[PDB]
Amino acid sequence: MQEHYQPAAIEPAAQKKWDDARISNVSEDASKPKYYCLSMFPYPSGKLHMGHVRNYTIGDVLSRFKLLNGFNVMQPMGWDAFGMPAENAAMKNNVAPAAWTYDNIEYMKTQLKSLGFAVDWEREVATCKPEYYRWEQWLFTKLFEKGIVYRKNGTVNWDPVDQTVLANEQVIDGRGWRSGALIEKREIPMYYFKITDYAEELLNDLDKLEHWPEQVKTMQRNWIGKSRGMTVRFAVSDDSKQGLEGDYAKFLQVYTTRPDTLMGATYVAVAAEHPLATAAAADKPELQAFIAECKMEKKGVPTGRYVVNPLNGDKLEVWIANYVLWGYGDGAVMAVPAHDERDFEFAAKYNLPKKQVIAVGDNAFDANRWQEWYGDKENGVLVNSGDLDGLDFQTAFDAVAAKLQSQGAGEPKTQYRLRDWGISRQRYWGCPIPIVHCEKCGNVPVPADQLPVVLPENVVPDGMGSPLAKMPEFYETSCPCCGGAAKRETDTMDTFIESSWYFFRYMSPKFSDGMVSAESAKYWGAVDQYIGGIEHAIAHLLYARFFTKLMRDEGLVNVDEPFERLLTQGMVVCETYYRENDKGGKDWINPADVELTFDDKGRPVSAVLKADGLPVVISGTEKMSKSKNNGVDPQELINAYGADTARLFMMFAAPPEQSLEWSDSGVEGAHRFLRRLWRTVYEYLKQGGAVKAFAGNQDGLSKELKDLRHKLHSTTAKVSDDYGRRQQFNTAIAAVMELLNQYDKTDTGSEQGRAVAQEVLEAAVRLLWPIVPHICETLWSELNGAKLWEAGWPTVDEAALVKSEIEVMVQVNGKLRGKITVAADASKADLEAAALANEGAVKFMEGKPAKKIIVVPGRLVNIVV
Ligand SMILES: Nc1ncnc2c1ncn2[C@@H]1O[C@H](COP(=O)(O)OP(=O)(O)OP(=O)(O)O)[C@@H](O)[C@H]1O
Ligand SMILES: CC(C)C[C@H](N)CO
Ligand SMILES: [Mg+2]
Ligand SMILES: [Mg+2]
Ligand SMILES: [Zn+2]
């Protein structure tokens, strides 16, 4: 064994050894229980950085832990290679998108292989390859036939800088998710996935996800935004039917989420476009006037027409209001000023009545001043509401529904804030949309036998709109239904399509007859463990659940939910710098290329780019990001310190969910521990070579060696709990450091000492193998001739956890009066102290003090009083 810890020697050799053994290349093996551990795959948008090291080392620790515990572990990696992240990176580096993406993939694969993650590289996928994207084109056509995918014009989110529409989940603070530019509204036709058809299932199935962070589930619940409401019909009065036709002569229909307040409605408000607006305004120019202004600030006019409250018979006047849009669904609303602030305003304004139908506790009701308990929907009971009196919100809701339905005057109605998912993009680098536009047949899907519609890879976008829209060699084609001249769709699919199903593709990435083979889907089931940032909560983590339910309903998979456990690792953060460019954007600058000037107290005041000595903007600590050019490249840390140092630092510096600020001192501290581990094994082997590890009954072992075995097996129990239940890796390392601390203070030079040292060191290197496998593999081979991954996870010897104690009898004047339990090395004075604390001795000494305390070593204490 060499004295110096030399990562450049031992890390390539350990990786070759694992690769040759094919430890990470797995099949559908029914002999071992499956474990599918997945880290969210990266965009080819730059070099990986130490934040990726944290993400992917967490996954590797969990994978290697389960591997040592006898699971069939699939841990796959691949490339989220289509769409805006890869294409924008290519354009920023003046490379064609395809050439950029494939070269960047090769660099990222080199970076990850140097880190020694236990990855099944035979399951590698690149989502920009036709072998991948043909299957999402397939699913698209299947769903398009059923109307679950559809094309429709409408108002959309337009990003003027990325020059594309965006989905609602890609608008962050009114800005595009990659550009940071303010989003505009445009009317552009788009292709949509009808995710609202699955809104109830996507909401309710969140309750299944006991092992997701509550915050992720709450964010998705609020994004879906279910509201249980009530459709309510007010019959039009017999004298207000002039001009109306059809159902609009019969009743006025409204939607409300407070049907518990229906007994308190005092008027209704109607849109300027709703038919009763027109009928009342037909002979009313002062009403056509309001209609014209309309066709915020609440303005309203009475119409003279009246409708009838179905629950109490009240006649209510219909109002035109500018706050009622002809897209409301009904285009008309009821008004309860006593319990809704908006209605309280528009009724205090126009002096419209306010009737109280809710009481919350003993709060007085002032009909002149609004209070926020008027809107309390959780702690209220109904008043002035007939047989609804005394009901709470949920009970009154169901009772109002029964009432309305008994007379056919209403029914429950659910709405959602969720809107359908707009997926088409005016961008080149993405999956082609398998649609052909025929002047005779309409928008027709490309038949399955003609998929994929292949994206040409030799395109350099000119930065002026959709490049495929300028390529008749791509879009001129024949109609698949009639054979006539037609045009391919030139919009492409958004990147989030590929990431919504890649975790199924990993199960059978070479399956050429479908998205995923039935046999492999049945074997791997769902992802047991998913690791990625909380930034994915509203987009990917919602889209992926939706796609899973789609594929299940197509009969491709048999799970309802893609990810069983989710760990959202904290962000590695570091300094950021940029310059404003002449295009109005920001050129981000790596901290390594910056020279800082400081203060008298150490404040960074100015910063310059070393290349030109010209200023840069100090932007402050922020998430390490490829797109902000602030990453620390792990390959450079590996070249200087070794991959194990990079991995150990990221696992030790904080609990995995906590933000982790970059520091060079953290790097050196991790390396010094690895030197300590190396030196500890080297010095042990130097003084006699390896021996058979202690095992079995430990009677006859010295107290110091028993204490070390207690610490050893306590440490195994703790690390096991930390990897397997708590998923906390910093405390596992600290626990092994404490074991080594005790080892250092223990004399292990004797024959039994060396046996215990071997046991300690064999356990330590296995306990740490998931975190720093290179050094642990190498040290194990110097200690022990067997294969580490065949020796398995260390076992807790419960016999080693029993404390060394003795029971001593206490007497008073010779008569035995009790029994005490003392440490095995307790002094004679500890026995005297403990014996005089025995309730038997105290009770039978009768207050008298001891005349003498006879002690027989470790057997008997005799208190003479
Ligand atoms: N600073 C970071 N700390 C921890 N995990 C990170 C960090 N940056 C990215 N990740 C994680 O790495 C995975 C891949 O993300 P991605 O490819 O978007 O990297 P990125 O640095 O965010 O790139 P980009 O800036 O182009 O979005 C995700 O699970 C993401 O949460
Ligand atoms: C699962 C994917 C949406 C992850 C992205 N490629 C990185 O944020
Ligand atoms: Mg369950
Ligand atoms: Mg990212
Ligand atoms: Zn046709």
Author numbering: 1 to 295, 307 to 876
Paper text:
To correctly aminoacylate tRNALeu, leucyl-tRNA synthetase (LeuRS) catalyzes three reactions: activation of leucine by ATP to form leucyl-adenylate (Leu-AMP), transfer of this amino acid to tRNALeu and post-transfer editing of any mischarged product. Mechanistically similar to other adenylate-forming enzymes, the class Ia aminoacyl-tRNA synthetase (aaRS) LeuRS charges tRNALeu isoacceptors, which are essential substrates for protein translation. We have solved crystal structures for all enzymatic states of Neisseria gonorrhoeae LeuRS during Leu-AMP formation.
To understand the role of this peptide-plane flip on the global conformational changes and its effects on enzymatic catalysis, L550 was mutated to an alanine or glycine and the crystallization of both mutants was performed. Comparison of the captured apo and pre-transition states of both mutants show the same large domain movement, including closure of the active site by the CP1 hairpin and structurally associated α-helix (M84-N93), that were seen for the WT structures. Despite the occurrence of these substrate-induced changes, including the shift of the priming loop, no peptide-plane flip was observed in either mutant pre-transition state structure. This is likely the result of the absence of the clash between the side chains of E169 of the CP1 hairpin and A550/G550 although the side chain of E169 maintains the same interactions as seen for the WT pre-transition structure. Our biochemical data show that in the absence of steric constraints the peptide-plane flip is not necessary for the amino acid activation.
